[PDB]
Protein backbone atom coordinates (compact mmCIF):
# COMPACT_ATOMS: atom_id res chain seq x y z
CA UNK A 1 0.00 0.00 0.00
CA UNK A 2 3.08 2.21 -0.29
CA UNK A 3 2.98 2.92 -4.03
CA UNK A 4 -0.82 2.87 -3.86
CA UNK A 5 -0.75 5.70 -1.32
CA UNK A 6 1.51 7.72 -3.62
CA UNK A 7 -0.78 6.93 -6.55
CA UNK A 8 -3.74 8.34 -4.60
CA UNK A 9 -1.66 11.44 -3.84
CA UNK A 10 -1.05 11.98 -7.56
CA UNK A 11 -4.75 11.44 -8.28
CA UNK A 12 -5.68 14.12 -5.75
CA UNK A 13 -3.28 16.61 -7.35
CA UNK A 14 -4.63 16.15 -10.87
CA UNK A 15 -8.17 16.20 -9.46
CA UNK A 16 -7.56 19.80 -8.40
CA UNK A 17 -6.18 20.56 -11.87
CA UNK A 18 -9.42 19.35 -13.45
CA UNK A 19 -11.44 21.22 -10.81
CA UNK A 20 -9.66 24.55 -11.31
CA UNK A 21 -10.07 24.28 -15.09
CA UNK A 22 -13.82 23.91 -14.58
CA UNK A 23 -14.32 27.53 -13.52
CA UNK A 24 -12.11 28.79 -16.35
CA UNK A 25 -14.18 26.90 -18.92
CA UNK A 26 -17.40 28.04 -17.22
CA UNK A 27 -16.22 31.66 -16.95
CA UNK A 28 -16.45 32.14 -20.74
CA UNK A 29 -19.72 32.71 -22.66
CA UNK A 30 -20.47 30.37 -25.64
CA UNK A 31 -22.30 31.64 -28.78
CA UNK A 32 -23.26 29.66 -31.94
CA UNK A 33 -23.20 31.40 -35.38
CA UNK A 34 -26.19 30.04 -37.40
CA UNK A 35 -27.60 30.70 -40.88
CA UNK A 36 -26.72 30.41 -44.54
CA UNK A 37 -23.21 31.26 -45.64
CA UNK A 38 -22.16 34.55 -47.23
CA UNK A 39 -24.90 36.33 -45.27
CA UNK A 40 -22.66 38.60 -43.17
CA UNK A 41 -20.76 36.10 -41.03
CA UNK A 42 -17.44 37.60 -42.15
CA UNK A 43 -18.34 41.06 -40.85
CA UNK A 44 -19.10 39.70 -37.35
CA UNK A 45 -15.96 37.57 -36.90
CA UNK A 46 -13.14 39.74 -38.30
Amino acid sequence: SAEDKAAVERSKMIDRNLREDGEKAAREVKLLLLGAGESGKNTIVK
Partner: protein, 173 residues
Protein backbone atom coordinates in the same frame (compact mmCIF):
# COMPACT_ATOMS: atom_id res chain seq x y z
CA UNK B 1 -12.55 21.50 -42.86
CA UNK B 2 -13.64 21.96 -39.25
CA UNK B 3 -15.08 24.54 -36.81
CA UNK B 4 -13.19 27.64 -35.52
CA UNK B 5 -13.31 28.83 -31.86
CA UNK B 6 -12.27 32.54 -31.77
CA UNK B 7 -11.38 34.41 -28.57
CA UNK B 8 -12.32 38.00 -27.85
CA UNK B 9 -12.62 39.80 -24.51
CA UNK B 10 -14.48 43.00 -23.66
CA UNK B 11 -15.50 44.63 -20.37
CA UNK B 12 -13.68 41.95 -18.31
CA UNK B 13 -15.74 39.08 -19.79
CA UNK B 14 -14.06 36.38 -21.88
CA UNK B 15 -16.00 34.99 -24.88
CA UNK B 16 -15.28 31.90 -27.06
CA UNK B 17 -17.52 31.92 -30.20
CA UNK B 18 -17.63 28.60 -32.15
CA UNK B 19 -17.60 28.98 -35.98
CA UNK B 20 -19.51 25.71 -36.71
CA UNK B 21 -20.58 25.32 -40.39
CA UNK B 22 -17.61 24.16 -42.53
CA UNK B 23 -18.84 20.71 -41.32
CA UNK B 24 -20.64 19.10 -44.33
CA UNK B 25 -21.73 15.92 -42.45
CA UNK B 26 -25.11 15.08 -40.80
CA UNK B 27 -24.54 17.98 -38.32
CA UNK B 28 -27.46 16.53 -36.27
CA UNK B 29 -24.98 13.86 -35.05
CA UNK B 30 -23.11 16.75 -33.32
CA UNK B 31 -25.92 19.36 -33.04
CA UNK B 32 -26.55 17.94 -29.55
CA UNK B 33 -22.76 18.24 -29.05
CA UNK B 34 -23.24 22.06 -28.94
CA UNK B 35 -25.63 22.37 -25.94
CA UNK B 36 -25.10 24.18 -22.63
CA UNK B 37 -24.51 27.29 -24.76
CA UNK B 38 -25.89 30.42 -23.11
CA UNK B 39 -27.12 31.87 -26.41
CA UNK B 40 -26.85 31.51 -30.18
CA UNK B 41 -26.34 34.20 -32.82
CA UNK B 42 -28.26 34.06 -36.10
CA UNK B 43 -26.94 36.16 -38.98
CA UNK B 44 -29.44 37.26 -41.64
CA UNK B 45 -28.62 39.15 -44.85
CA UNK B 46 -31.24 41.86 -45.32
CA UNK B 47 -30.44 42.30 -49.04
CA UNK B 48 -31.33 38.67 -49.86
CA UNK B 49 -35.17 38.79 -49.55
CA UNK B 50 -35.22 39.10 -53.39
CA UNK B 51 -32.21 37.00 -54.44
CA UNK B 52 -33.22 33.47 -55.46
CA UNK B 53 -30.96 30.41 -55.45
CA UNK B 54 -29.84 29.78 -59.03
CA UNK B 55 -29.45 26.02 -58.54
CA UNK B 56 -32.84 25.58 -56.84
CA UNK B 57 -34.61 28.23 -58.98
CA UNK B 58 -37.59 27.82 -56.63
CA UNK B 59 -36.41 28.62 -53.07
CA UNK B 60 -35.71 32.21 -52.04
CA UNK B 61 -32.47 33.09 -50.27
CA UNK B 62 -34.36 34.53 -47.30
CA UNK B 63 -37.04 31.82 -47.37
CA UNK B 64 -34.29 29.20 -47.05
CA UNK B 65 -33.20 30.86 -43.81
CA UNK B 66 -36.80 30.63 -42.56
CA UNK B 67 -36.71 26.83 -42.67
CA UNK B 68 -33.30 26.73 -40.97
CA UNK B 69 -34.35 29.24 -38.30
CA UNK B 70 -37.57 27.35 -37.57
CA UNK B 71 -35.76 24.02 -37.20
CA UNK B 72 -33.14 25.48 -34.83
CA UNK B 73 -35.67 27.04 -32.45
CA UNK B 74 -38.31 24.29 -32.56
CA UNK B 75 -36.04 21.36 -31.66
CA UNK B 76 -36.03 19.94 -28.14
CA UNK B 77 -32.27 20.49 -27.79
CA UNK B 78 -32.36 24.31 -27.94
CA UNK B 79 -35.46 24.87 -25.80
CA UNK B 80 -33.42 26.25 -22.88
CA UNK B 81 -31.23 28.69 -24.85
CA UNK B 82 -31.94 32.21 -26.08
CA UNK B 83 -31.75 33.45 -29.68
CA UNK B 84 -29.75 36.47 -30.85
CA UNK B 85 -30.66 37.90 -34.26
CA UNK B 86 -28.22 39.87 -36.42
CA UNK B 87 -29.13 41.69 -39.64
CA UNK B 88 -26.31 42.37 -42.10
CA UNK B 89 -25.91 45.05 -44.77
CA UNK B 90 -28.83 47.34 -43.99
CA UNK B 91 -27.42 49.94 -46.40
CA UNK B 92 -28.08 47.63 -49.38
CA UNK B 93 -31.46 46.59 -47.86
CA UNK B 94 -32.38 50.29 -47.36
CA UNK B 95 -31.27 50.92 -50.99
CA UNK B 96 -33.35 47.90 -52.15
CA UNK B 97 -36.20 48.56 -49.64
CA UNK B 98 -37.83 50.84 -52.29
CA UNK B 99 -35.82 49.54 -55.30
CA UNK B 100 -37.19 46.01 -54.61
CA UNK B 101 -40.76 45.80 -53.15
CA UNK B 102 -40.98 44.22 -49.64
CA UNK B 103 -43.52 41.88 -51.34
CA UNK B 104 -40.61 40.03 -53.05
CA UNK B 105 -39.99 38.54 -49.56
CA UNK B 106 -43.42 39.28 -47.97
CA UNK B 107 -46.11 39.39 -50.74
CA UNK B 108 -48.75 39.69 -47.95
CA UNK B 109 -46.85 42.86 -46.87
CA UNK B 110 -48.45 45.83 -48.71
CA UNK B 111 -47.08 48.65 -46.49
CA UNK B 112 -45.04 51.56 -47.92
CA UNK B 113 -41.49 50.45 -48.93
CA UNK B 114 -40.40 53.08 -46.33
CA UNK B 115 -37.44 51.42 -44.54
CA UNK B 116 -38.72 52.04 -41.00
CA UNK B 117 -42.08 50.41 -41.86
CA UNK B 118 -40.65 47.44 -43.84
CA UNK B 119 -37.95 46.77 -41.19
CA UNK B 120 -40.75 46.53 -38.60
CA UNK B 121 -42.76 43.87 -40.45
CA UNK B 122 -39.78 41.65 -41.28
CA UNK B 123 -38.55 41.83 -37.67
CA UNK B 124 -41.91 40.64 -36.33
CA UNK B 125 -41.94 37.80 -38.88
CA UNK B 126 -38.84 36.23 -37.32
CA UNK B 127 -40.27 35.46 -33.87
CA UNK B 128 -43.70 34.05 -34.86
CA UNK B 129 -42.49 30.55 -35.77
CA UNK B 130 -41.80 28.86 -32.44
CA UNK B 131 -44.72 26.93 -30.96
CA UNK B 132 -43.71 27.89 -27.41
CA UNK B 133 -42.28 31.33 -26.61
CA UNK B 134 -42.74 31.52 -22.82
CA UNK B 135 -39.20 30.25 -22.20
CA UNK B 136 -37.81 31.47 -25.55
CA UNK B 137 -36.51 35.02 -26.04
CA UNK B 138 -35.18 36.64 -29.22
CA UNK B 139 -32.86 39.66 -29.17
CA UNK B 140 -33.19 41.25 -32.61
CA UNK B 141 -30.51 43.71 -33.70
CA UNK B 142 -29.70 45.64 -36.87
CA UNK B 143 -25.88 45.96 -36.63
CA UNK B 144 -24.28 47.65 -39.65
CA UNK B 145 -22.52 46.96 -42.93
CA UNK B 146 -19.23 47.50 -41.08
CA UNK B 147 -20.82 46.46 -37.75
CA UNK B 148 -18.53 48.59 -35.59
CA UNK B 149 -20.81 48.79 -32.53
CA UNK B 150 -22.34 45.30 -32.60
CA UNK B 151 -19.99 44.16 -29.82
CA UNK B 152 -21.91 46.21 -27.24
CA UNK B 153 -25.23 44.56 -28.09
CA UNK B 154 -23.95 40.98 -27.83
CA UNK B 155 -22.32 41.85 -24.49
CA UNK B 156 -25.67 43.12 -23.21
CA UNK B 157 -27.64 40.26 -24.78
CA UNK B 158 -25.64 37.54 -23.00
CA UNK B 159 -25.91 39.39 -19.68
CA UNK B 160 -29.71 39.28 -19.89
CA UNK B 161 -29.73 35.50 -20.38
CA UNK B 162 -26.91 34.83 -17.90
CA UNK B 163 -28.97 36.34 -15.07
CA UNK B 164 -32.15 34.69 -16.37
CA UNK B 165 -30.50 31.25 -16.46
CA UNK B 166 -29.26 31.58 -12.87
CA UNK B 167 -32.70 32.54 -11.55
CA UNK B 168 -34.39 29.61 -13.32
CA UNK B 169 -32.46 27.00 -11.33
CA UNK B 170 -32.54 28.92 -8.04
CA UNK B 171 -36.33 29.18 -8.25
CA UNK B 172 -36.37 32.97 -7.84
CA UNK B 173 -38.10 33.20 -11.23
Amino acid sequence: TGIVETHFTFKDLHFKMFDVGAQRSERKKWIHCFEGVTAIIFCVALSDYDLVLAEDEEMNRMHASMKLFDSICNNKWFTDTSIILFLNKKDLFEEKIKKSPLTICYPEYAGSNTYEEAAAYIQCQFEDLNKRKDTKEIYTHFTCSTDTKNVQFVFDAVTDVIIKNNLKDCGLF
